[PDB]
Amino acid sequence: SVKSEYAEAAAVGQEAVAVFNTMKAAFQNGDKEAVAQYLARLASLYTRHEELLNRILEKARREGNKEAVTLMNEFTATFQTGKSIFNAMVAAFKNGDDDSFESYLQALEKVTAKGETLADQIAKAL
Numbered sequence: 016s017v018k019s020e021y022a023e024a025a026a027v028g029q030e031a032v033a034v035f036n037t038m039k040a041a042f043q044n045g046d047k048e049a050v051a052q053y054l055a056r057l058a059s060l061y062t063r064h065e066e067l068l069n070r071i072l073e074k075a076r077r078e079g080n081k082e083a084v085t086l087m088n089e090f091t092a093t094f095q096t097g098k099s100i101f102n103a104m105v106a107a108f109k110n111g112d113d114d115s116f117e118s119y120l121q122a123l124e125k126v127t128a129k130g131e132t133l134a135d136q137i138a139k140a141l
């Protein structure tokens with residue numbers, strides 16, 4: 016069901032949380048080789064999460080589930096804010112700009128924590 020597809024998407028989201036927190040520790044410790052690998056892992060995870068979310072939104076639309084479509088439109092919009100910040104973080108790492116990396120890292124954390132009430136709302140709506 017679309018509901019079980021959303022639980023699979025939620026797990027991929029939690030995997031990115033886990034890797035992101037490990038990556039933050041590596042960044043603080045100056046282990047740039049680890050950071051590079053974690054950033055590649057996160058890009059793959061976000062790409063997967065984004066695709067699963069789009070399929071869920073498209074299905075909710077085909078089902079006529081108006082409330083779920085509303086919430087998923089809002090949620091995917093916030094997802095893109097996170098993605099833009101993530102991409103900027105990756106660029107800051109490439110450029111050696113640790114000040115911007117720190118800034119983007121904190122912003123991505125706050126964007127992500129803010130989106131969690133909506134994430135739970137969607138599970139109930141599907």
Ligand SMILES: Cc1cc(C)nc(N)n1
Pocket residue numbers: 028061093094095096097098126127130
């Ligand atoms: C990139 C991103 C953004 C938001 C709001 N939530 C998640 N899980 N991932």
